[PDB]
């Protein structure tokens, strides 16, 4: 059902043309359905929403003090970006050096939900593993969710291999997002500590 624990969840949305405008709406929906099943609060589950192409568009920050309802709305209002490339390396790097530059909330697990539907050019993957290892060194769990037949499988397998908690969810389409939404929310919640 619902998650009331200490967690810092970062939604990373593939912003490539690999996802149609309509498909990206399904993705954004799943993200909002998720926020609905999380206890969004600075004392419980904090959320950040970022859409990624060549760069990152941060719509919600973990420190953003806005009513959950407001945050779910902002999420639903995430502009579609049909870029030819959505750099996973760049988002993890951005997640690493920007989002988790400092760990202000050690009492919370950190999960980077990497919703991916594309595959960046190899030259962009050069430091891929190094970024995933850097995240691991801040204890930021990286959960990869493959969507569609273009989601970088190599990188998905590679992320699972970097750390034991990095579990992957490989879906055939944004339509499976809803069917698995609950198992995904459960897993992420179970990687978080309840609070006393």
């Amino acid at each position, epitope marked *: 059902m619902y998650c009331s624990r200490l967690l810092d969840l970062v939604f990373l949305l593939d912003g490539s043309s690999r996802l149609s405008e309509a498909e990206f709406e399904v993705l954004k929906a799943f993200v909002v359905d998720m926020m609905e099943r999380l206890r969004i609060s600075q004392k419980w589950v904090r959320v950040a929403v970022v859409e990624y192409h060549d760069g990152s568009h941060a719509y919600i920050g973990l420190k953003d003090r806005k009513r959950p309802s407001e945050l779910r709305r902002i999420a639903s209002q995430v502009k579609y970006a049909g870029s030819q490339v959505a750099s996973t390396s760049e988002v993890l790097k951005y997640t690493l050096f920007q989002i988790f530059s400092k760990i202000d909330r050690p009492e919370a697990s950190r999960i980077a939900l990497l919703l991916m539907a594309s595959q960046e*050019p190899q030259r962009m993957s050069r*430091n891929f593993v190094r970024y995933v290892q850097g995240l691991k060194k801040k204890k930021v769990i990286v959960i990869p969710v493959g969507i569609g037949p273009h989601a970088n499988l190599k990188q998905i397998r590679l992320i699972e291999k970097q750390a034991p908690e990095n579990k992957a969810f490989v879906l055939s389409s944004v339509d499976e997002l809803e069917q698995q939404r609950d198992e995904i929310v459960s897993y992420l919640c179970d990687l978080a500590p309840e609070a006393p």
Partner: antibody, heavy 122, light 108 residues
Framework: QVQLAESGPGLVAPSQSLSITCTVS????????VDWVRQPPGKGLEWLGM???????DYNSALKSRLSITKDNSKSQVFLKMNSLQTDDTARYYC????????????????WGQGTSVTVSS | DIQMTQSPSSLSASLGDRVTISCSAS??????LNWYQQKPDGAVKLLIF???SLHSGVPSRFSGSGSGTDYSLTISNLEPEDIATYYC?????????FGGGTKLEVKR
């Protein structure tokens, strides 16, 4: 087995361009990358750029975007193209294989070619 | 550009000698260092990669070590065919940069 052979112009007038084809053998260009390294006379080695198995490339910013590396997987050939060559671009140019395996962060220049000398003067 | 420094450019040794070539980096390069050999006839070959792994067919007299900013290549017993120039190269950050090189010279 693994081989790499250069075929260059030998000579190049200033302002002109250098075109070198690297004929590789003993491996598939979809599996490995290919780098270009040059050595100015009486000087050390210099890394120019490379082209991954998928075709993406990486260039040495110092070349002021004068370099282009493309290839033809079927013809096991990688083409280097450099614009506006100056005298100080005179050097022996080698095409070198490299794993281009970001999975293992493995980019060693494991197998080099004999190289080709390039003299740039009027 | 990470600057790779190989202090001695010329290194006199005697066959049988144990030789050590040093390479230092302008910054921490997390053991992302390779060692290359260019024989007098111009041939270049990779000897050691990732600081200490020997490349296929490379004799065990060659060994590499180091971490952080200081690395080195060692030839346990110098063989004649080992007379050549040695270059270290970092792959910590693009573009890849080589050291100035160290040419082995025979003592007489």
């Amino acid at each position: 087995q693994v081989q790499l052979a250069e075929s260059g112009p030998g000579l190049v007038a200033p302002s002109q361009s250098l075109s070198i084809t690297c004929t590789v053998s003993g491996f598939s260009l979809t599996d490995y990358g290919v780098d270009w390294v040059r050595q100015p006379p009486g000087k050390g080695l210099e890394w120019l750029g490379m082209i991954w198995g998928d075709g993406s490339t990486d260039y040495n910013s110092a070349l002021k975007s004068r370099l282009s590396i493309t290839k033809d997987n079927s013809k096991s050939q990688v083409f280097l193209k450099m614009n506006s060559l100056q005298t100080d671009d005179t050097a022996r140019y080698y095409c070198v294989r490299d794993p281009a395996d970001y999975g293992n962060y493995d980019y060693a220049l494991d197998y080099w070619g004999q190289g080709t000398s390039v003299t740039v003067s009027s | 550009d990470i600057q790779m420094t190989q202090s001695p450019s010329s290194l006199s040794a005697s066959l049988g000698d144990r030789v050590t070539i040093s390479c230092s980096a302008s910054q921490d390069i997390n053991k992302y260092l390779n060692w290359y050999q260019q024989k007098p006839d111009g041939a270049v070959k990779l000897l050691i990669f990732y600081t200490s792994s020997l490349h296929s067919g490379v004799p065990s007299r060659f060994s590499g070590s180091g971490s952080g900013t200081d690395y080195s290549l060692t030839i346990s017993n110098l063989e004649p065919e080992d007379i050549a120039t040695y270059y270290c190269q970092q792959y910590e950050k693009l573009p890849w940069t080589f050291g100035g090189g160290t040419k082995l010279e025979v003592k007489r």
